From a paper:
RecF is a multifunctional protein involved in recombinant DNA repair, homologous genetic recombination, and DNA replication. Similar to RecR and RecO, RecF is a recombination mediator protein (RMP) in the RecFOR pathway for ssDNA gap repair. RecF contains the conserved Walker A motif, Walker B motif and signature motif of ABC-ATPase that exhibits ATP-dependent dimerization; additionally, the signature motif residues interact with the ATP bound to the opposite molecule. To gain insight into the mechanism of ABC-ATPase RecF, we solved the crystal structures of TTERecF, TTERecF-ATP, and TTERecF-ATPɤS.
The results of size-exclusion chromatography demonstrated that in solution, TTERecF (42 KDa) forms a monomer, whereas TTERecF-ATP (84 KDa) and TTERecF-ATPɤS (84 KDa) form a dimer. The structure of TTERecF consisted of two domains. Domain II contained six α-helices (αB, αC, αD, αE, αF, and αG) and two β-sheets (β7 and β8), in which the signature motif was the loop between β8 and αG. Domain II is similar to Lobe II subdomain of Rad50 and SMC protein; however, in the Rad50 and SMC proteins, helices corresponding to αD and αE extended into a long coiled-coil region, which was absent in TTERecF. Comparison of the structures of the ATP-free TTERecF and one monomer of the ATP-bound TTERecF dimer showed that the two monomers were similar. The root mean square deviation (r.m.s.d) was 1.015 Å under Cα trace superimposition. Notably, two structures differed in terms of their conservative Walker A motif and Walker B motif. In ATP-free TTERecF, the last turn (residues 35–38) of the helix αA in the Walker A motif occupied the ATP binding site, whereas in the binding of ATP with TTERecF, the last turn was flipped by 180° relative to the ATP-free TTERecF to create a space for ATP to further interact with TTERecF. Moreover, the helix αH of Walker B motif moved by 4 Å relative to the ATP-free TTERecF. The KD values of the TTERecF monomer interacting with the 21mer ssDNA and dsDNA were 576 nM and 1.63 µM, respectively, however, the TTERecF-ATP dimer binding 21mer ssDNA and dsDNA showed KD values of 16 nM and 6.2 nM, respectively.
Numbering used by the authors: -1 to 365
Write the structure that this text describes.
């Protein structure tokens, strides 16, 4: 039984009026003339998956202008639940309150997995086009939805990384800190090796899944190069990678003290998408990049289902309007057995099993 959002209630959320909405199976077409309105609804849905705004927005920005809180409640059907309640509340205080079936979660990260979605947007092309930062963050979020252990390791890794970076400054002003520096190096190498091993594993699946879609769509060839920070290309034996990280951290101490940051580790790494053997960021055409962005999300979807045994809900934020007919048809074919939410400016273009009109932030069914 696939994931299915039966209902969402939004209160003081961005520009949406207070309302409870009920949805259907298959394609939920949401059309309207407002920008914020449509994608704000998608933002509220995606929030129940991730515990954050997909736009990258801070929580205080999600509260309705001049209000003191927002609140979102979804009801979801999944493999093991007829109807799970997920609640996300934020008070301008600065505390998120998140509950699943009435139990408050200790940390936001705990939300991950109760409600699976994959969100498509035209912005996904930036994952192809931009720097390592954008691709690490995409990669980290994809793996974390599947793998709680990886999420745990990344949290600790990033915590140790900032502790180390601030210690570098203390070691520069005063001296000393040699002991905490060893302790941090050891921890970075330990967490780093596990992060690298899991990343390598995911990217191998990404490569296999993405090459199939690309071959299907444009008959083009896909390769992925993972340049990891251990410089290894083996990534079986964790202790070998851990040792390579540790030695590298030791060898780069002079450079680290000059810049007051940490030059080696997975927080610096990237992966390279090759299209017909050429670097997709600097060589490929825009059409190719766009196609690659689509294959990227389709793969995400495929790996997510395969790994969790659950079939996610699909969010498509304004991704249909600039497509030609053959690409629309392809994408629609691929959403076949999912619940999906497709935002559009038009009612006619893609039909949809249920159609909703949004205006002045009220969503009404049929039109």
């Amino acid at each position: 039984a696939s994931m299915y959002l039966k209902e969402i209630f939004v209160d003081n959320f961005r520009n949406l009026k207070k309302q409870k909405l009920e949805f259907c199976e298959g394609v939920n077409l949401i059309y309207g003339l407002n920008a914020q309105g449509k994608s704000n609804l998608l933002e509220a849905i995606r929030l129940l998956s991730m515990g954050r705004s997909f736009r990258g927005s801070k929580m205080s920005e999600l509260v309705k202008f001049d209000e003191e809180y927002f609140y979102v409640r979804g009801l979801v059907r999944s493999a093991d639940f007829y109807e799970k309640k997920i609640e996300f509340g934020y008070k301008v205080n600065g505390n998120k309150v998140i509950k699943v079936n009435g139990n408050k979660l200790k940390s936001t990260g705990e939300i991950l997995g109760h409600f699976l979605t994959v969100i498509f947007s035209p912005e996904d092309i930036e994952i192809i086009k931009e720097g390592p930062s954008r691709r690490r963050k995409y990669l980290d979020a994809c793996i974390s939805v599947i793998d709680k252990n990886y999420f745990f390791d990344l949290l600790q890794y990033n915590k140790t990384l900032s502790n180390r970076n601030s210690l570098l400054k203390k070691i520069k002003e005063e001296g000393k800190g040699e002991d905490l520096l060893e302790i941090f190096d050891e921890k970075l190498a330990e967490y780093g090796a596990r992060i690298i091993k899991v990343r390598n594993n995911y990217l191998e699946k990404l490569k296999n899944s993405m090459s199939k879609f690309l071959m299907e769509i444009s008959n083009e060839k896909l390769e992925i190069i993972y340049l990891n920070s251990a410089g290894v290309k083996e990534v079986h034996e964790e202790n070998l990678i851990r040792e390579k990280l540790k030695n590298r951290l030791t060898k780069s101490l002079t450079l680290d003290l000059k810049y007051l940051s940490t030059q080696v580790g997975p927080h610096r790494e990237d992966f390279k998408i090759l299209i017909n053997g050429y670097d997709s960021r600097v060589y490929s055409s825009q059409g190719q990049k766009r196609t690659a962005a689509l294959c990227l999300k389709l793969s995400e979807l495929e790996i997510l289902e395969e790994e969790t045994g659950e079939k996610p809900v699909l969010l498509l934020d304004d991704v249909m309007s600039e497509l030609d007919d053959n690409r629309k048809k392809y994408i629609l074919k691929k959403l076949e057995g999912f619940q999906s939410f497709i935002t559009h400016t038009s009612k006619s273009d893609v039909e949809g099993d249920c159609c909703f009109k949004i205006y002045d932030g009220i969503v009404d069914k049929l039109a």
